[PDB]
């Protein structure tokens, strides 16, 4: 009947051709419009084999978001493979619009509607669509924003839990607000605010689920070990101006009987960064007197397990990120491309 295949998909979006927004601009070409009648076809009682970590769709979306950024975000100068280039860096509007991924005639996407499913193995409630759903290409570190949500319980995805060089995606069944502000009247100084009471509820249940995977083992959160500020800081984006957030106050082992509320963590803009599109560094300009502000939905955490838990009785976990494919893996887990007649 049907068969696993790696075809070339196309993108669909509810873009607007008039708006000069980078996302609308890039999605006005490369994408087609958008299906107003997306046909979902419940596969009777079939059972299929998914694997979110060997999914070609992630590589195709990776390429798309790559080509979105380094063709529509203007870098003052980029330094990479033994070369330096010059360009103009005009400031732009920036808001990620949902992108649907679509199979050409001769192919369909199988979809998993298993309420609690960790992107590997059997599915059971197999469905079939000719296009994925509204997936905002939100590029972030340590925290996934404006993404999907686990229908029922918190889910824990990892290609191999015993391999601690693999990233852990934790998929929340509860959205969390994150208000990040770059006021008017220091220039580069931003701050971020998150309902501490609400937030600590989520974390408590996240540690409880993580404990479920680890035979009742004491769960510890520690700030990231070392490396490029892009992974040690929750580094996301706002109105084209890259923020960098210190999440140490966030993963607070104490605040788990009294504690408090409004958690306020530092965060700051950067003009030089490390491109995620390739190994290299990138020059950019500062803002201009605007009250730069984004609210975002926390929908998951990028985590890393240590390797001194062969002893003790406590497993430590550190904020992660940097592998941007993983962001795309957190939304493309329930899909896989299949070839029919």
């Amino acid at each position: 009947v049907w068969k696993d295949a790696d075809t070339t998909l196309f993108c669909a979006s509810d873009a607007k051709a008039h708006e000069t927004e980078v996302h609308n601009v890039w999605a006005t070409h490369a994408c087609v419009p958008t299906d107003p009648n997306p046909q979902e076809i419940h596969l009777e009682n079939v059972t299929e084999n998914f694997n979110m970590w060997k999914n070609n769709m992630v590589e195709q979306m990776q390429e798309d978001v790559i080509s979105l950024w380094d063709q529509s975000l203007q870098p003052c100068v980029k330094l990479t493979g033994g070369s330096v280039i010059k360009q103009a860096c005009p400031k732009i509007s920036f808001d990620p619009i949902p992108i649907h991924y679509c199979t050409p005639a001769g192919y369909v996407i199988l979809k998993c509607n298993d309420k609690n499913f960790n992107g590997t193995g059997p599915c059971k409630n197999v469905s079939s669509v000719q296009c994925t759903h509204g997936i905002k290409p939100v590029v972030s570190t340590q925290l996934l924003l404006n993404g999907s949500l686990a229908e029922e319980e918190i889910i824990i995805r990892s290609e191999n839990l015993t391999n601690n060089a693999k990233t852990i995606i934790v998929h929340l069944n509860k959205s969390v607000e994150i208000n990040c502000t770059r006021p008017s009247n220091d220039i580069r100084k931003a701050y971020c605010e998150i309902n501490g009471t609400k937030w600590n509820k989520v974390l408590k249940q996240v540690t409880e689920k993580l404990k479920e995977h680890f035979n009742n083992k004491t769960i510890i959160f520690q700030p990231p070990s070392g490396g490029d500020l892009e992974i040690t800081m929750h580094s996301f984006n706002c109105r084209g101006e890259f923020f960098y957030c210190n999440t140490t106050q966030l993963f607070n082992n104490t605040c788990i009987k009294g504690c408090n509320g409004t958690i306020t963590l530092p965060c700051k803009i950067k003009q030089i960064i490390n491109m995620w599109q390739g190994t290299g560094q990138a020059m950019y300009a500062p803002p201009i007197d605007g009250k730069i502000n984004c609210v975002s939905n926390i929908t998951g955490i990028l985590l890393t397990r240590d390797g001194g838990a062969n002893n003790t009785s406590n497993e430590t976990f550190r904020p992660g990120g940097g592998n941007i494919k993983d962001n795309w893996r957190s939304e493309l887990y329930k899909y896989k491309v299949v070839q029919i007649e």
Binding site: S225, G226, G227, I231, M275, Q277, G278, G320, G322, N323
Partner: peptide, 27 residues
Amino acid sequence: XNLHFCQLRCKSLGLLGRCAXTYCACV
């Protein structure tokens, strides 16, 4: 990611180097 660069710069903190995508991580 510059892996060998990352391994040395992490060794600065007595930690091992890993590439996290196009970035450097230390454990």
